[PDB]
Structure 1
């Protein structure tokens, strides 16, 4: 029973493969860390203005008095709510 047992002690090396699957999990770790840190130019995006909504008007249009400034009829986006004006 030469290789009748050699192959069995190499079936034991499937438990060597769990360490490899662990290492594959280690490489999958920090992959989303690097894909998060490369996507920090989202934070490098230009600023924005806080304003004052009087009340909306027709044709999906609204009004904003910004911080020191007068009135500016501004345009609406898609992911927002006219019903929350």
Structure 2
């Protein structure tokens, strides 16, 4: 029994220490991957254009609103899902 109990105790020690090591390593990976994902989504959004800037003159019922934008002028536009 001495062999058996001694070796399982040893195994427990190394396993727990390496579990803490794994905690550290996994945390580092979970920060690096998060950062990489952040950068990727940033670039994907960076591909999208500048969407203009305008001011509304008169709402004219759901799905249609009038807005004036620099010298493009005043345009009527359907609102999005919001």
Shift of 1:68: 1.2
**Where in structure 2 are there 5+ consecutive unaligned residues?**
none
**Where in structure 1 are there 5+ consecutive unaligned residues?**
79-85
Q: Secondary structure in 1 aligned to 2:35? A: helix
Q: What RMSD in Å do the two structures reach over aligned CA positions?
A: 3.6
- Relative distance call for 1:20 and 1:69 in structure 2 (3 A) is closer
Moved over 2 A (4+): 1-39
> How many residue pairs end up in the alignment?
78
Q: Tell me the TM-score normalised to structure 1 length.
A: 0.55
Distance 1:14 1:25 in 2: 17
Give CA deviations for 1:31-78 in whole Å, capped at 9, x if unaligned: 432453354121121221111211101243110111013321111111
Q: Secondary structure in 2 aligned to 1:76? A: coil
Distance 2:20 2:35 in 1: 24
Higher helix share: 2
